[PDB]
Amino acid sequence: FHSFSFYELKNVTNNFDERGNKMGEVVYKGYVTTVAVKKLLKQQFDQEIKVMAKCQHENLVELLGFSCLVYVYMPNGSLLDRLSCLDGTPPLSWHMRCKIAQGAANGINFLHENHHIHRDIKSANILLDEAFTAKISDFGLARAVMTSRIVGTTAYMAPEALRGEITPKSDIYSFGVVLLEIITGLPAVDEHREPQLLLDIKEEIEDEEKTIEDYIDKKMNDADSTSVEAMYSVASQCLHEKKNKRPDIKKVQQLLQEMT
Numbered sequence: 612f613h614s615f616s617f618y619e620l621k622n623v624t625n626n627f628d629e630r631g632n633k634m635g636e637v638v639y640k641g642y643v644t645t646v647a648v649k650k651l652l653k654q655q656f657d658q659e660i661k662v663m664a665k666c667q668h669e670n671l672v673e674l675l676g677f678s679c680l681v682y683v684y685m686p687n688g689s690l691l692d693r694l695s696c697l698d699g700t701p702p703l704s705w706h707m708r709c710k711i712a713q714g715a716a717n718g719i720n721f722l723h724e725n726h727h728i729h730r731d732i733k734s735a736n737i738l739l740d741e742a743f744t745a746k747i748s749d750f751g752l753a754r755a756v757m758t759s760r761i762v763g764t765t766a767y768m769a770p771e772a773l774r775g776e777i778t779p780k781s782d783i784y785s786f787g788v789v790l791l792e793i794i795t796g797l798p799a800v801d802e803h804r805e806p807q808l809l810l811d812i813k814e815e816i817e818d819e820e821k822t823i824e825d826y827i828d829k830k831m832n833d834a835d836s837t838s839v840e841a842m843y844s845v846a847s848q849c850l851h852e853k854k855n856k857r858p859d860i861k862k863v864q865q866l867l868q869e870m871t
């Protein structure tokens with residue numbers, strides 16, 4: 612990685628302009644080569660560099676350098692934003708959704724093959740490059756087992772992860788939630804919606820209260836029941852309450868390939 616100075620990153624962000632250079636959180640839009648600057652805690656900074664040095668893959672965001680963490684800028688933002696058509700972007704087609712799901716699984720496979728647990732798999736952490744290729748980001752919580760500090764997004768977390776367990780099996784559950792967001796175009800949690808949690812639609816379908824067809828994102832024109840049901844079957848297997856009954860990432864990756 613390339614080592615940068617604080618002023619060397621201050622003026623590229625136009626003196627950290629909150630609008631306009633602010634992307635979110637804090638993340639700022641600079642130029643070196645279009646880049647994403649994450650200004651931060653110190654413990655999570657060191658781990659982020661450690662994971663990025665060993666983990667290089669086409670389905671993982673690339674770290675450019677450090678100071679502040681600089682990444683190559685993903686022109687099509689997050690999968691979360693694209694699924695909600697944020698800022699007027701056109702809906703993702705079923706064909707693109709399938710490639711994104713496959714790409715995300717390839718990224719998680721690489722992390723797991725290298726004995727790494729992500730711990731924060733979610734659609735906000737799946738970035739999209741110039742060709743809409745899935746790029747897994749945010750390795751600040753990533754680990755190479757119990758914990759007193761329960762971390763992550765509750766809407767995506769496995770039951771054992773909320774109880775304090777750290778296991779690659781929890782990454783599988785979280786990926787299952789992402790797969791449901793891809794099928795439905797719905798956010799994992801919505802307080803102004805019934806059911807509030809998306810993972811709960813699995814129960815509604817299993818109890819025959821509703822069908823998968825009832826939940827298919829209506830903002831697509833190219834979905835077919837066969838591939839939609841095959842992705843839902845993967846999502847359902849991933850969302851097993853018993854961690855040992857979930858498929859490993861290699862089986863998920865295998866099932867998503869047989870889908871196309």
Ligand SMILES: CC(=O)N1CCN([C@H]2CC[C@H](Nc3ncnn4ccc([C@H](C)CC(N)=O)c34)CC2)CC1
Nearest residue numbers: 634635638647649682683684685688689735736748
């Ligand atoms: C409410 C509203 O307007 N928005 C629109 C903007 N949106 C976000 C803002 C951050 C953004 N992050 C990144 N973009 C591009 N490349 N890139 C490389 C690494 C990173 C990040 C540090 C990691 C990450 N997982 O975010 C990025 C993704 C889209 C929030 C909702």
